[PDB]
Amino acid sequence: MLDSLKSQFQPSFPRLASGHYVHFLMLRHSQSFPVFQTDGVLNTTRTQAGLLEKTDQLSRLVMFKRKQTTPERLAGRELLRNLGLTSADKSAKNLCEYNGEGSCKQCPDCILYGFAIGDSGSERSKVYSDSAFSLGAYEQSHRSFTFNAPFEGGTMSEAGVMRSAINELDHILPEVTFPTVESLRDATYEGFIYVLGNLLRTKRYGAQESRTGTMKNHLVGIVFADGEIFSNLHLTQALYDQMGGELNKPISELCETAATVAQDLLNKEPVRKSELIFGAHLDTLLQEVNDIYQNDAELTKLLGSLYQQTQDYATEFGAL
Amino acid sequence: MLDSLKSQFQPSFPRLASGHYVHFLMLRHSQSFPVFQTDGVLNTTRTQAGLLEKTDQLSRLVMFKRKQTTPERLAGRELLRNLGLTSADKSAKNLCEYNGEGSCKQCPDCILYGFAIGDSGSERSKVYSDSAFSLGAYEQSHRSFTFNAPFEGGTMSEAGVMRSAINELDHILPEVTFPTVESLRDATYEGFIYVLGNLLRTKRYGAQESRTGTMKNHLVGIVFADGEIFSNLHLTQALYDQMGGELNKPISELCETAATVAQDLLNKEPVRKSELIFGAHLDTLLQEVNDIYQNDAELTKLLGSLYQQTQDYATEFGAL
Amino acid sequence: MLDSLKSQFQPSFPRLASGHYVHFLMLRHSQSFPVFQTDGVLNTTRTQAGLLEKTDQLSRLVMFKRKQTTPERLAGRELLRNLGLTSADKSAKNLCEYNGEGSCKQCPDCILYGFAIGDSGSERSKVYSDSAFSLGAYEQSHRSFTFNAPFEGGTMSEAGVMRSAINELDHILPEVTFPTVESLRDATYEGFIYVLGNLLRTKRYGAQESRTGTMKNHLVGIVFADGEIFSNLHLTQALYDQMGGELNKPISELCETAATVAQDLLNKEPVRKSELIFGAHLDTLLQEVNDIYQNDAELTKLLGSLYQQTQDYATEFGAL
Numbered sequence A, B, C: 001m002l003d004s005l006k007s008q009f010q011p012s013f014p015r016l017a018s019g020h021y022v023h024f025l026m027l028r029h030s031q032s033f034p035v036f037q038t039d040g041v042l043n044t045t046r047t048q049a050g051l052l053e054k055t056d057q058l059s060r061l062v063m064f065k066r067k068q069t070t071p072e073r074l075a076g077r078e079l080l081r082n083l084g085l086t087s088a089d090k091s092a093k094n095l096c097e098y099n100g101e102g103s104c105k106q107c108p109d110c111i112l113y114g115f116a117i118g119d120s121g122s123e124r125s126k127v128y129s130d131s132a133f134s135l136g137a138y139e140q141s142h143r144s145f146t147f148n149a150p151f152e153g154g155t156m157s158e159a160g161v162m163r164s165a166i167n168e169l170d171h172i173l174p175e176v177t178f179p180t181v182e183s184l185r186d187a188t189y190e191g192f193i194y195v196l197g198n199l200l201r202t203k204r205y206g207a208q209e210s211r212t213g214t215m216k217n218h219l220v221g222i223v224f225a226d227g228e229i230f231s232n233l234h235l236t237q238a239l240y241d242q243m244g245g246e247l248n249k250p251i252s253e254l255c256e257t258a259a260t261v262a263q264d265l266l267n268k269e270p271v272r273k274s275e276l277i278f279g280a281h282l283d284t285l286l287q288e289v290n291d292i293y294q295n296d297a298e299l300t301k302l303l304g305s306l307y308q309q310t311q312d313y314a315t316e317f318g319a320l
Helices: A002-008 A070-082 A108-112 A189-201 A232-241 A251-266 A279-289 A296-316 B065-082 B108-113 B189-201 B232-243 B251-266 B279-293 B296-316 C002-008 C070-082 C108-112 C189-201 C232-243 C251-265 C280-292 C296-318
Strands: A021-030 A044-048 A057-063 A115-118 A121-123 A142-146 A168-172 A177-185 A215-225 A275-278 B021-030 B044-047 B058-063 B142-148 B166-172 B177-185 B215-225 B273-278 C021-030 C044-047 C058-063 C127-129 C132-137 C142-146 C168-172 C177-185 C215-225 C275-277
Touching (some): A002 A189, A002 A279, A021 A189, A021 A251, A044 A232, A070 A108, A108 A296, A177 A189, A177 A232, A189 A296, A215 A251, A215 A279, A251 A275, B021 B189, B065 B108, B065 B189, B065 B296, B108 B296, B177 B189, B177 B232, B189 B215, B189 B279, B189 B296, B215 B251, B215 B279, B232 B251, B251 B273, C002 C280, C021 C189, C021 C251, C070 C108, C070 C189, C108 C296, C132 C232, C177 C189, C177 C251, C189 C280, C189 C296, C215 C251, C215 C280, C232 C251, C275 C280, C280 C296
Antiparallel strands (some): A021 A177, A142 A168, A215 A275, B021 B177, B044 B058, C021 C177, C021 C215, C058 C132, C127 C177, C132 C177, C142 C168
16 A cells, blocks of 8 residues: 555655645544634634535635644644754754744755744645635534633632623533645655655644644545645535435444545546545555554654655755 | 538748738636735726626736736747657757857747747747736725745744744635636647647646645637737726626636637628637537647647648748 | 653653653543532533444533632642641742632642733643543432521521522532543653552532532543543443433443443544553552552652643743
8 A cells, every 4th residue: 555655656855846746535523622812702604504505605614724724833843852853952953843934945845834033934735735624604603601700718709799701602512523634745755745744644633732633634535636626625624525414423424425425526536546545545645654653663664764864855845 | 520620721831921810719717815015015907897787997916917928938948848849957959048148949848938049040930919908896806815934943933032934925715717718820730739738738827836826717709800909908898897896706607708708709800700719619629639638649749740840931031 | 650651651741741641541420419610500511422332312421621720729738837847827938829810830749730820920831631521411410498597597497488599509419420531741741650649639619518419530541642532422422322212220230331332432543652550460450559648758758749840831931
């Protein structure tokens, strides 16, 4: 399986895109009450329910554009430090900061996900995400919860009366699904294993990182192609049409439906498709990548390779 | 169907336009929050609402002139490198560089979408665009989103005080339609398949590509005619008249009513119309240009002959 | 044994996560009719019963996002006050109020479990949990009682009346269990023993110490890892499938099955494991750390150095 896929990749990171995309068709299933916001309320927008049959307007939750992908990103940096390929000690040569001018130009994060400082310029993301939409209606997918605010006395008062204005926040129900296609451009085999790593290995998405928003990244297909396949909203609208809106059905049936909708859509997409990894071939591919992780030497090897490569790219086609 | 269209096109690119213009009438539908900006705010302009249901006062969003031509253009250059017709690397015979201190004068991109170089020659675009306009008003078609860039330690605190890396950004909504009429002049058939290819194949349009700005172009008619045709704005104002407000209707009701408006408008413009591909003829033509782009041998052939023609154009009529 | 594990931790808290986690797996068993809400009714969510042999009518109880952080946290702060390294006394040098401008930036609670002063300083939590989901249906986990109000005198038996507050109130039945996973980032060894104490010591759940709401924290494993293990919901779904839905079997059968379900799930996730502790190697760890927790002469030394490290951290990286 994996030994075959090494043929589908570039031998080193190219100057400009050579038209090789790999697309990851995921279902993100909520577990434990994520929050997604850019103001005092959950992000939501009206959409058509589905493409052909289900036709009414339907308010959907929006997993807005970086809640989708900075949890992936920062989970990768956590491994690059753990393997000693980067460091946070400001006196070390291996330094890489985030969101500041100390952020390096050499490491797999900076090159696969991108940077901009001014000095030493900038690099554009090779991982293209999109904003994702809840498969079902917002008004069937949410609750607003009051949050308790006690004092060290073990009771709700300083003295005589309680704390005024105990507040609410709005949270997303478990077992609601955000179908999402994320895509990697012009990468090497190692670079694929780093990004596919981050997608499977990260779990904490929501606002309150340390109290909620662990999610399940149920990857349904990996599709190699010469361009952009369908949008995330187009996959959601198709996936609703295929079920006629009876979305209250078991998660594995929704996972097999997403596989069969993806193939129905991919066969009417104007792109060459060298490999459509789905189903029993994919459950073989993902278990064999989960055996490249779960091992110290196999990761040391590949990521070291990646770093060499990403460093070479930084030296020949990045800064200076 | 496409074997009939070979009779409409010219047998090689001519020295001057002989009046044979092919036009692509499209609705571009936002799939994920585009940014169409030039100056740190979304582009808008006040317009008459429609050709009747009049005002001089409806503010509608602008997909400004380049924001549509470059994403299409660059998806072509990506395919030319992928089919191995051109290359990205210095010290090769078929290098093509974009916006560069030099460039080739030979590849399909250079001859169809155009170039200029200050020490050398220039060539005008065979592909013509307007700025595209939103069918609905700005206030019903946008939201502004806060974004923040913390230290990856999970707070804005730089060891005790807030660096406050926070601002707000303006975004177009999904389900927002930009009616568009692209045009191509004095083409060859494989040149038309290249341009129709780029319109069908590209999806990442706006600013911040790696995170936002998927669209779907639904092509509603391909008109072959002896002249220029209605503006993006004139089509938009006729489509707003035909619906009379009421813009929250389904996407399938928009694509069919746009085809109806386009035919009424095509009867009022002083052009001979050699062919009017709409409806069931169009979703046959699009299905056969899908099976060109999905097939590796056919696509190599067509686009290879295009390469030769554009090279012949270069050495006989272009910058040599 | 326990000082070999001391190697699997850093000699200081780091500036950013160097990618070491330890995760604690625990079946929180209920008795004494608990209440996990201060909002209206016992929190309940419909779920699929499990990953196979599954239906999605299963409205299980949920323990929400701080109803299992704030107990352990307050029960821990009360220890490091009782052992004498911080105080609640109005103007002491070592004062740590739980909220507001006098609240600490340098005691172990503030660095392990987190803080924000609104503005003027914050640090993100190092200990992570999600809302936990019960192993059974609400209708198979439910009893109700009622509220009576003998404030002063409180006797009305010849009149035949009681006060306006009287209502029927739902409470969580005994023999129920709430599988939970908790974890901490980048600990020192004494900080690991501190949190492992707080997990093991705490009895009370909900807002108050009187009447209902005391529970048994049956720790089923601890696992050292390079990232997130399964979700709080995934374990309960996986264990319900393995147990085959018939929950009424003895509590010891719940406790042994969770170690063999953890051993299966832990081998599927893309996560390295420096260590994993279960069965005969877990109970021999737990009896040893509980020996520190009842031998105050060495307990003081442990937390003593924690404070030394917590404050070295607070002035090096936390809040100067």
